[PDB]
Amino acid sequence: MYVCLCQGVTDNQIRDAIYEGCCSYEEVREATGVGTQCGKCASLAYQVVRETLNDL
Numbered sequence: 070m071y072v073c074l075c076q077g078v079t080d081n082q083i084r085d086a087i088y089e090g091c092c093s094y095e096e097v098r099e100a101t102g103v104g105t106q107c108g109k110c111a112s113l114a115y116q117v118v119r120e121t122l123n124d125l
């Protein structure tokens with residue numbers, strides 16, 4: 070699903086960044102651009118990051 074429409078980031082793309090070593094929401098933002106242009110997606114993006122990290 071889409072997480073971030075401003076940057077076109079999907080939940081799979083967030084997981085891809087974590088599977089390449091990102092270990093925090095901030096690093097996922099650095100790798101994907103999620104949440105950089107407005108406030109709408111931050112809550113969802115953080116939840117996807119946390120669920121993904123907890124499953125590793």
Ligand code: FES
Pocket residue numbers: 072073074075076103104105106107108109110111
């Ligand atoms: S929807 Fe993600 S930065 Fe705007």
